[PDB]
């Protein structure tokens, strides 16, 4: 029945300086960004403001300076049993993508009710 966005989160995904001893590949790390969310249900607008968390572990001071709105991993939480689909040129959730502009999504409820959502994300450096 419900086709809502309930949360908008983001990660900075990056190559740590560590290498796998067998494959020789650089190991990937991910850091969740701090957030504020503004969910406007009436207008189907989900807004998030991300801030860069303090340095720690492989998320060094140098890596904090690499966090970019043009290459951000965004994820959403939706209503129980709802399915979200990107519209037009919208990036997929869970993949590094350009989030400098807002993007539209179709959220489909368990009963098949569809609701168009606009996701708008900013980064405060
Ligand atoms: Cl984290």
From TrEMBL:
- Top-level taxon: Bacteria
The segment(s) forming the DUF5018 domain are: 5-120
- Entire protein: which part is shown? 35 to 159 of 159
Protein's UniProt name: DUF5018 domain-containing protein
